[PDB]
Amino acid sequence: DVAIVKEGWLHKRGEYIKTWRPRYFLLKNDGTFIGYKERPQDEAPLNNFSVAQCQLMKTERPRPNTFIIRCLQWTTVIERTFHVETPEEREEWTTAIQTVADGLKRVTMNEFEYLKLLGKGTFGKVILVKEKATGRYYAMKILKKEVIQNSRHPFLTALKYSFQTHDRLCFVMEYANGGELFFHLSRERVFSEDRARFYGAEIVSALDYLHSEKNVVYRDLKLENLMLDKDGHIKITDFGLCKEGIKFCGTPEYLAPEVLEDNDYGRAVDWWGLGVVMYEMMCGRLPFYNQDHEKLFELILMEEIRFPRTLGPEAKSLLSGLLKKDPKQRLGGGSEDAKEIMQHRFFAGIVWQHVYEKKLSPPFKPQVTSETDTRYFDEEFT
Numbered sequence: 346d347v348a349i350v351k352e353g354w355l356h357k358r359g360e361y362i363k364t365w366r367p368r369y370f371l372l373k374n375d376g377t378f379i380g381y382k383e384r385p386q387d388e389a390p391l392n393n394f395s396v397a398q399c400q401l402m403k404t405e406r407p408r409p410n411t412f413i414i415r416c417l418q419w420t421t422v423i424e425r426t427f428h429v430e431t432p433e434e435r436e437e438w439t440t441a442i443q444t445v446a447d448g449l450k451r452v453t454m455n456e457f458e459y460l461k462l463l464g465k466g467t468f469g470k471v472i473l474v475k476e477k478a479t480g481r482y483y484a485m486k487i488l489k490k491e492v493i494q495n496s497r498h499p500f501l502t503a504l505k506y507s508f509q510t511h512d513r514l515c516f517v518m519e520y521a522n523g524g525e526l527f528f529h530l531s532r533e534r535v536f537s538e539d540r541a542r543f544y545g546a547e548i549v550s551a552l553d554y555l556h557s558e559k560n561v562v563y564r565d566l567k568l569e570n571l572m573l574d575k576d577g578h579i580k581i582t583d584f585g586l587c588k589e590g591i592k593f594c595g596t597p598e599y600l601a602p603e604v605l606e607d608n609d610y611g612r613a614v615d616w617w618g619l620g621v622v623m624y625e626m627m628c629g630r631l632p633f634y635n636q637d638h639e640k641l642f643e644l645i646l647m648e649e650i651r652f653p654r655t656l657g658p659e660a661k662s663l664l665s666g667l668l669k670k671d672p673k674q675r676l677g678g679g680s681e682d683a684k685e686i687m688q689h690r691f692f693a694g695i696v697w698q699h700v701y702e703k704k705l706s707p708p709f710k711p712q713v714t715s716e717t718d719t720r721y722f723d724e725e726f727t
């Protein structure tokens with residue numbers, strides 16, 4: 346009952362590298378729109394690729410015969426722009442996408458206090474706010490309404506409120522007050538293997554939820570998106586906004602190779618990101634680094650990662666498997682997904698139900714009195 350509707354070659358604009366590339370795309374009954382570097386020989390459906398509840402737009406800028414699939418996924422607006430040689434191909438491409446999309450078919454702003462602008466994007470901004478009545482701290486995604494339920498896990502930032510105005514759509518999210526993780530790692534230079542095991546285990550727990558329960562790739566696992574709460578447990582943030590890049594988008598040193606090549610990607614992307622995160626916690630440096638992006642791309646794509654002699658054998662086996670450049674060969678790329686990492690020797694002795702229930706002791710208790718303490722918001726944040 347799941348079958349291809351339309352397939353063929355498209356010109357896809359790279360999501361992080363804004364260059365046009367030829368990709369073979371498949372439009373399926375389940376609504377999945379996946380592009381491949383070569384024709385697929387022919388895995389569970391990922392929501393990242395679905396065209397359900399997305400809007401289609403045809404345009405002649407930046408280049409003619411372009412169509413844009415615009416989706417709201419959770420609280421982030423994402424775009425995928427494609428280009429065919431003739432307007433006829435576009436029209437029959439868009440209608441098929443529109444066919445499958447249709448075929449598969451009191452809180453106000455004054456209650457908060459504006460504090461600090463966290464980020465600007467194409468379709469809105471993110472702002473650190475404080476709820477006046479409670480004094481708690483929240484991030485508010487304010488999205489332009491012209492352009493357009495919570496599911497809780499211990500280590501994901503909760504979407505607390507959702508409201509809209511005449512022209513805005515607002516998502517209020519819990520903001521942890523235990524400090525950014527890049528701040529704690531910088532102050533302590535390197536984390537112990539046990540400290541990184543605690544942090545890694547909680548991330549693996551949340552990644553399993555998103556992969557199996559939610560059927561989505563997080564695709565943005567990096568140190569800057571990790572925070573600690575008042576107790577010292579991990580919260581994976583969701584404060585991202587789709588920006589049109591600078592003259593390329595984002596910081597490429599974290600990107601999985603299959604994403605860097607705009608190739609087909611799956612749940613294995615987050616395990617690469619897990620490898621990058623835990624490599625830096627246990628080594629104190631990023632695995633790949635060079636100022637030239639041409640070299641950095643080649644580094645991430647070609648140069649195999651090197652380890653310091655300070656790391657133990659269990660750590661080196663985990664990092665090597667997570668940072669395998671082939672996602673089919675990568676630790677966590679099989680059907681068992683998160684189970685491959687949970688069953689790894691580095692996580693021996695870890696009872697995984699205990700991790701979900703926050704039974705493991707945080708090795709680092711942040712110096713905060715309560716959930717309203719603003720120590721890591723003050724100018725001691727240096």
Ligand SMILES: CCC(=O)Nc1ccc2[nH]c(=O)n(C3CCN(Cc4ccc(-c5nc(Cc6ccc(O)cc6)c(=O)[nH]c5-c5ccccc5)cc4)CC3)c2c1
Nearest residue numbers: 360392418419421423501502561563565583587588594595
């Ligand atoms: C260069 C700058 C730029 O523009 N970069 C860029 C370019 C192209 C992009 N293309 C993209 O996608 N991104 C982003 C889109 C957003 N993610 C992050 C992300 C992924 C899943 C979720 C997410 N999700 C569902 C459930 C869910 C619901 C609906 C759905 O469709 C899928 C899942 C859910 O319950 N909790 C979460 C969640 C909530 C809190 C904390 C953690 C997870 C929340 C956030 C990262 C990749 C792009 C980014």
